[PDB]
Symmetry: C6
Subunit: 219 residues, 6 copies
Amino acid sequence: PIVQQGQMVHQAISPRTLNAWVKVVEEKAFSPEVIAMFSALSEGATPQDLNTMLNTVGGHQAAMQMLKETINEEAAEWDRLHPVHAGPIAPGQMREPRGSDIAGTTSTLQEQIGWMTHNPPIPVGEIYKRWIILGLNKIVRMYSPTSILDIRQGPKEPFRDYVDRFYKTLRAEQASQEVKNWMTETLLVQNANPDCKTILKALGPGATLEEMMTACQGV
Amino acid sequence: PIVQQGQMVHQAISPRTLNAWVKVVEEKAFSPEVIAMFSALSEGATPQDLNTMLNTVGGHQAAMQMLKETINEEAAEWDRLHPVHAGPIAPGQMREPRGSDIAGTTSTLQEQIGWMTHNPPIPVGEIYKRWIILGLNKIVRMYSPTSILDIRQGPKEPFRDYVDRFYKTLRAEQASQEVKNWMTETLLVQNANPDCKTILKALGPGATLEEMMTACQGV
Amino acid sequence: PIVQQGQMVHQAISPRTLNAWVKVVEEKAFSPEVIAMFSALSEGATPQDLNTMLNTVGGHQAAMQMLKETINEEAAEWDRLHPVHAGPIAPGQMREPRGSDIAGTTSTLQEQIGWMTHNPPIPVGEIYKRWIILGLNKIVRMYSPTSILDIRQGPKEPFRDYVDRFYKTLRAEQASQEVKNWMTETLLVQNANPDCKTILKALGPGATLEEMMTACQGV
Amino acid sequence: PIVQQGQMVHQAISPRTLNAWVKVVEEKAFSPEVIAMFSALSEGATPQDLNTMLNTVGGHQAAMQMLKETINEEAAEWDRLHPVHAGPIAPGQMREPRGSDIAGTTSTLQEQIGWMTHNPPIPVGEIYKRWIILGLNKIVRMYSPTSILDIRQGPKEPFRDYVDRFYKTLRAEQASQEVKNWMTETLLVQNANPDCKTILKALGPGATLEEMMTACQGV
Amino acid sequence: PIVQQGQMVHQAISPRTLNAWVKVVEEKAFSPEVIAMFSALSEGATPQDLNTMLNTVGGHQAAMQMLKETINEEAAEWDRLHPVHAGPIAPGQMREPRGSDIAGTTSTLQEQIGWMTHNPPIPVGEIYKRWIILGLNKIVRMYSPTSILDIRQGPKEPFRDYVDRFYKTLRAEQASQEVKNWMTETLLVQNANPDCKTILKALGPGATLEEMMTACQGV
Amino acid sequence: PIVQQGQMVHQAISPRTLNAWVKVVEEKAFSPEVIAMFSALSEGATPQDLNTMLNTVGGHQAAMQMLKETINEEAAEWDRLHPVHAGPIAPGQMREPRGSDIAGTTSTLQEQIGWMTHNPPIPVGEIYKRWIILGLNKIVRMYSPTSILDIRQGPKEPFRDYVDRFYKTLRAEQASQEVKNWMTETLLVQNANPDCKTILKALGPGATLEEMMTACQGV
Ligand SMILES: [Cl-]
Ligand SMILES: [Cl-]
Ligand SMILES: [Cl-]
Ligand SMILES: [Cl-]
Ligand SMILES: [Cl-]
Ligand SMILES: [Cl-]
Ligand SMILES: [Cl-]
Ligand SMILES: [Cl-]
Ligand SMILES: [Cl-]
Ligand SMILES: [Cl-]
Ligand SMILES: [Cl-]
Ligand SMILES: [Cl-]
Ligand SMILES: [Cl-]
Ligand SMILES: [Cl-]
Ligand SMILES: [Cl-]
Ligand SMILES: [Cl-]
Ligand SMILES: [Cl-]
Ligand SMILES: [Cl-]
Ligand SMILES: [Cl-]
Ligand SMILES: [Cl-]
Ligand SMILES: [Cl-]
Ligand SMILES: [Cl-]
Ligand SMILES: [Cl-]
Ligand SMILES: [Cl-]
Ligand SMILES: [Cl-]
Ligand SMILES: [Cl-]
Ligand SMILES: [Cl-]
Ligand SMILES: [Cl-]
Ligand SMILES: [Cl-]
Ligand SMILES: [Cl-]
């Protein structure tokens, strides 16, 4: 990665960042917390470090291939919006990057460092990072076993655990924040068990989750 | 985070800070020492690092949603007290942050760094940190199984263990320091077993905890 | 903490310092080596880092409350000896700290850093550290099960192990160095088994521990 | 390695980089993720650090000898393309390296540092690294047990696992990207079980892997 | 410790240095490799760091008391050879240290840093370190179970293991290098079993250990 | 060690370098990868750090004594080739080192640092390192159980494992690169089982190890 005297300086990815990432993928497979951990360990990372984290993943090669295809689609879109102009790169200048240069496959470390440290800066690491997080979101969608519509509270299930399951499944859903707001406003109270459902409906439509959980504590 | 030649310099969150936090949440669930550990690992942290620590938490998504709602309430309060003024940001200036900018959802890393390193400084990391600790206190309240009124000394229980339980439950209570002072002055001596209660009452109302524990040592 | 180009620079407490301290308290409970480890891990620490180490302790809340009361007594004594003078803090100056400012409860990180880096320096971290070590000494006193007067050598016990026990119990005793010198000069030879006691008395009152241990080696 | 004030500074290889590499070779034997981990841990490395990583490998000495022979072939090719010219090295100059100087066997650390920090730079570490990755690719080829032509989907095998196996075996194949593209376009759909094969053929030749996996989800 | 821009800068003792030392004392008790590890972890250490390493030792308080007495004897000797002169410390000067100042009991961290960074330097850390290593040598002497005169080769014992035992016991012996040279020249060949003894005596008095071990390989 | 602003700066040996070395010697005893690990962990090391690594080795004191004798022989040879000249060391100069000064037994840390940072540099650390690696090579020779002449392929042994054994034993042999080349050209094909031997002889005398291993894959 690169960390900011004032100037931004280059640095190699640490061995325990790599070991942490590999352990995370080995243990947790693909889940939202794996994506959060990815963005955590890849702060200020170059495309070389991102490809470094991706290529060290053993197994799960179906998901890795899906991620490759997503990255290729985003790169082709970048090439459509940003057409490269033929010509000689002038002294004191750097070429404009392609989608493959952002993915680190056709660019050198010096070129990525120059794009990132330039003023104005071309943040290739955060763009490639954006594409990677997109594909990872697709993977987490495909590998989620349950749908949010099937999360129902058991007859003897404490409301707390039911909320744990509900928002666990909701975090993996692929829907805009408005759709998830609707799911919270409708499905959470709708799919509770009758004993808790009646009380929550007695609370009102504008209650917080704290009030809903403290209401069905005894039930 | 950011650490202070004299100037404050930016730095990425370390992998063992993240691993420490994730291990803490996995092992201890939600307790006061988890909050102390959070403030410990988040010294000088930016909102990006705070969201980094929060999003890497697997499970406990009910508590995470409650924390989201609390953060949204504090952000709306900030927006009420601090209304943004429409206009063009002048050269050599930075915009005043919203509640969502403090929460790191609508602000960039450069903007947070600029707000924190400015003179006068706008400490967005400590404000967002304050909100997070508030919501975490609410969670620790809701998830505490026992009330302080139910902590009673067993007939054969050593006074030391009874004090351990009493202040363990007291640390999770949500009450001002004056209320907790009253609880110490009344409930601790009131709820001891008769053999120790009579001796402590023979000591007097102004004895320290050291004197109370060394008094009921033999009992 | 703060580490000394020549200038003293601030730094956040490391995650493995915290993990080391928490592991120490979890494993060893309260013993002299725990205090030595505390002073070890808290070299150059600010009151914020000291409160950081104290608040991360799970359990043992009776001892933590005793430590709080001791810190409050030392703070009240500081307030008695150092009365604050009402007035406006002049430009280029910093206010004189209270006992609560030394304990880090009513002071900011910038104020502690300014007090510590000033010339003349107000070492709030070493003062608060002194109070903490005092209270910890009180706790170690209260939680010591055995008295030094009860450490007696068994009939078949090697003298070496008896000395191990004797100085183990002596390290936890609360007595000035002169009293401990008297205990070494009297109780050690007095409480040995007769076979070793007679030989040690044949050595003389001015023998070293090396000579005493090498004398009763065969016995 | 060497990390970039602006100047490139030398640094010794860290003990946990070495321990990470040795653990990787001990656990995973020879696989593509081992190569990715090698390039990960050897960012900015000198030939001395590369030989350091190679020589610390216990066992697998057949593969290490094959790697030695490959490195010798690449070095002889470098000597053929770059003939050394006899003469005295002028003041303010450095000799042009041989293949053995790139492999670090006949060059000193100061000479490698000088070649890498020079302008124009002679990147001996990335050249030797290239040769090493070449030989490692040969080894991974030889030690792959299965061919891509034999990866067939079981009758009750979920399509996801079959894709995992297919691209796992494909990653170890030695073929240009065009040949692997043909393998993806032909063998993947050809070697699926009939129930999934018919559906995938109903999709069309231009479907993505995401669509192919979400199509045969229920089958 | 203190590490050398050119100037010597102060630094706090690392948590894994402490953990390493504590683990070493817990596992290996008192042996020569423990002393080597002490000098290893205490490179450039101040008396505060040395007392830090010593006080964190749990148990073995007999040996710790012996070490205290040895340190006190060396300190009294220093006070005899270096008498302090009464007077006022002049501006731009520092007082000459006592034996207790070298032991870190009556001196501050600033005074130790000033003594060590001065020109001419007063190396209090290496002097106190010398005393500590002396006392540790006394302890290792007292706690050695076997004498070098009792190390004899078994009838079926390989010569290699017998040499391992011989020099293991010899490393713990308290004798000058000349005495140990005599022990090597006499006892090693004298105490071997007859089958190996006759061959070694056939070699001659001037053979190396390599020749002696390769001679009795088959026996 | 010492790491290169441009100037070479001194640094203490890290605790995990020491722990890594001690673990390596404890686990692997004496093998070539132990020597590679030694040179790995001792990059830029001073004689004090080399003696630090050597003295922390518990057990194996026969090998350590052999290493001492080898170091003494190399030191005596250095004294023969480099005779010290009697006289006063001039201001702005440093004395020429003896063999014992290179071994770190009769020289201080400041003298080693001065010898290494001087221009022209006297690399005492790499010289002492050379001697240590020499003695370690002698030890690895003596402790190798098998000779290269006895490595023969089993009747049902895969050729790959036989090559593993062959080059494992060859790496521990003490022979010049030409002798080892002859061993590769003769013994490897000579000592294979008849089924593989005939095929390898059908290949020809100029085949690579890759071709030899891929030829006897099916056998
Ligand atoms: Cl690291
Ligand atoms: Cl790869
Ligand atoms: Cl998967
Ligand atoms: Cl852009
Ligand atoms: Cl579920
Ligand atoms: Cl780290
Ligand atoms: Cl998230
Ligand atoms: Cl929870
Ligand atoms: Cl503000
Ligand atoms: Cl309880
Ligand atoms: Cl750390
Ligand atoms: Cl707290
Ligand atoms: Cl306790
Ligand atoms: Cl003061
Ligand atoms: Cl006891
Ligand atoms: Cl390291
Ligand atoms: Cl090697
Ligand atoms: Cl292998
Ligand atoms: Cl080139
Ligand atoms: Cl397979
Ligand atoms: Cl550390
Ligand atoms: Cl102590
Ligand atoms: Cl002991
Ligand atoms: Cl001196
Ligand atoms: Cl023995
Ligand atoms: Cl370290
Ligand atoms: Cl030693
Ligand atoms: Cl051995
Ligand atoms: Cl030289
Ligand atoms: Cl073998």
